[PDB]
Design a protein around this ligand. Structure first.
Ligand SMILES: *Cc1c(COP(=O)(O)O)cnc(C)c1O
Ligand SMILES: *Cc1c(COP(=O)(O)O)cnc(C)c1O
Lengths: 382, 382
């Protein structure tokens, strides 16, 4: 009933509260909850269901499989996926009524042929590369793509339901690239409208833009991270300041507590040495579980009413902590990350420790780690 | 039938060849194939089956669940797990005939009580903390533990089948700690034997020790990493020099190829800027898939017959590469890691790029990534 090694407790109520907090931030726009990568490590279906119930009108995933998984779980409503490769399940996605993004001619031709076999009109969204340089259509190819799209629409094969883009530095407030991208978007959106595209939705904002630039809202805001109670960056503030509540709490049970003499080496490479006769504790969770190895010696953990730092190298499935004089016993609970409001270490605390960003921390929590759900409605977790 | 985004191809024949290569390294000792953490990211059951067939007499996992999963898949033979927490499935493991490690009195008492309910004798192995400072019994507590064990044996509740330890710096050839640990092991092993313990197996070596110190072989060698064709460290040499063959090859299909002008920013933070009008390619695999974000700008990838470096920041599910003048098209295959013998980038190549160790690279490949099996016997993959 309760994992005895390490587990992730997901508060579905924090999720519902967050999308409401976020919906109030962009009152004029609709909210798309991005649940890609297993809902950033929190569990795709349960979180998708919870977000929807709290007001999310759109669901967004990266791959078709992720979107199809949502459908197979009986989730209804608008869903969109944008990461496609030649040969993907165009037919299956069209038949399940999922909005697919198009960034190249190759994509448009595969969806057109698939809409035929399916015998239905595919809802496509044109992505413009306004400067990120990742996916999307470059300005110099936009004209051609927009034309091919309105033509495919005429043939009744597809129907352009949206025009969108994505920011590269929205998490860095006041970055010059932000404005440059927004203008490029406006100008590219305009050209599409004049040439014949009448989209249902116009969107470009992610979590950081949604929280900072209301001029980026438009018809839809694509919020991923903020929905799970984690702030895109310390620059924007803490989840507390943003009015967000962390949904994930990673817990582990101590596997051992013992006394060691001064001068004793701890873990691989012996990068840590006891300063005196002290009590060492073994946390049974390592990098294969999602604890970044790069956080060796820095990672914060709450054990015996005090924050402890990872003693030495973090291993594949465990790492040790120095309890100093304090005492604890095997089976005692240790909190690796949770709510700063409860005096626990947080996702950002670990991002700093591992020299990375909070995004990677929560998302990289291993499948080996069981998830336990609280809050939301009973049928949300299944 | 074939993943169109990103997938891991596991050569089961490389696995069989490796355990044979390794068995020849320690002719006098028995080989335990460590398949913990989903066989270091290669797939626990298929790899466990293959290794066994090639000569592995023992199977080793960290958690009871991992070991129980092996049993539930019909795998027969000796299995051992060492990472336990109070409340674990002692009974279930005893009933499935799995050797459990004991490092504290608390563990001994839980197994004794469980052997009663089970109505059988539990095969336990005493772990000595010879200097690693992780799990195991500290020298100052050894006497007491050994006594409690021989007493529990008398009561017919348990049966000490082994005495073992683990190295902290065996991957660093000529490290002083290695010898110090080996001597501590010999002396601790002796005391156990005199006091009444007659073990089936005596072991302390991991992959690096097995390949370097034949005096650490004893009755059993616990080889994990080397079994998958990856070398514990560049110091020990390359898989080629060690006579090992890499079992994993990570492949991805290009999702887009487009032309961008000079001075264009690429990915989040705009940490990369095109030097000239060039061709950018989008690799649909990111850190949520196991591509370390810390390898941003350094990660090697084979595309269009040439090694390319990750252009800018690596995202959650994708990253871009600069093809310069070369040309490729969506759907073209890119190799992220494979066999250095085939001119492909390797696990170590990525460890360097991400400032980590090859161990973390293969093990952290996401569950989102499908595994495809080749070689071995047809029933191996199921
Ligand atoms: C992941 C993603 C989002 C959501 O970003 P957050 O910063 O997590 O809110 C939005 N749009 C696209 C294209 C994405 O890939
Ligand atoms: C993982 C592990 C091994 C195997 O180590 P490799 O270096 O991968 O061969 C051996 N013993 C213990 C206790 C382990 O945890």
């Amino acid at each position: 009933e309760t994992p005895t090694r390490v587990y992730a407790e997901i508060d579905l109520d924090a999720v519902r509260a967050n999308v409401r907090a976020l919906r109030a931030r962009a009152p004029r726009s609709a909210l798309m909850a991005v649940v890609k990568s297993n809902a950033y490590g929190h569990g795709a279906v349960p979180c998708a269901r919870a977000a929807q119930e709290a007001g999310a009108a759109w669901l967004g995933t990266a791959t078709p499989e992720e979107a199809l998984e949502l459908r197979a779980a009986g989730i209804q409503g608008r869903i969109m996926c944008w990461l496609w490769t030649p040969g993907g399940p165009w037919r299956e996605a069209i038949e399940t009524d999922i909005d697919v993004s198009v960034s190249g001619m190759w994509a448009l031709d595969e969806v057109r042929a698939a809409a035929r076999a399916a015998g239905r009109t595919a809802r496509i969204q044109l992505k413009a590369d306004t400067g990120l340089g990742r996916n999307g259509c470059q300005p110099a190819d936009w004209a051609e793509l927009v034309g091919a799209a309105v033509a495919a629409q005429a043939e009744g094969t597809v129907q352009v339901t949206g025009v969108w883009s994505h920011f590269a530095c929205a998490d860095e407030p006041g970055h010059p690239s932000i404005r440059l991208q927004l203008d490029a978007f406006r100008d590219m959106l305009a050209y599409a409208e004049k040439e014949g595209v009448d989209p249902e939705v116009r969107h470009i904002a992610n979590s950081p833009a949604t929280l900072t630039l209301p001029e980026t809202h438009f018809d839809l805001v694509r919020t991923g991270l903020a929905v799970y109670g984690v702030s895109p960056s310390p620059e924007l503030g803490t989840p507390a300041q943003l009015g967000l509540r962390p949904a994930m709490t990673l817990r582990a049970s101590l596997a051992l507590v013992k006394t060691v003499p001064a001068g004793h080496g701890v873990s691989y490479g012996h990068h840590y040495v006891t300063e005196s006769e002290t009590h060492l504790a073994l946390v049974p969770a390592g990098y294969a579980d999602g604890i970044p190895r790069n956080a060796s010696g820095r990672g914060p953990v709450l054990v015996a009413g005090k924050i402890r730092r990872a003693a030495g190298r973090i291993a594949m499935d465990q790492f040790v902590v120095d309890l100093g004089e304090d005492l604890a016993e095997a089976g005692d609970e240790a909190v690796i990350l949770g709510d700063a409001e409860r005096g626990e270490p947080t996702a950002e605390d670990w991002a700093q420790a591992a020299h990375t960003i909070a995004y990677e921390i929560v998302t990289r929590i291993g499948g080996r780690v069981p998830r336990v759900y609280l809050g939301g409605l009973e049928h949300h977790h299944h």
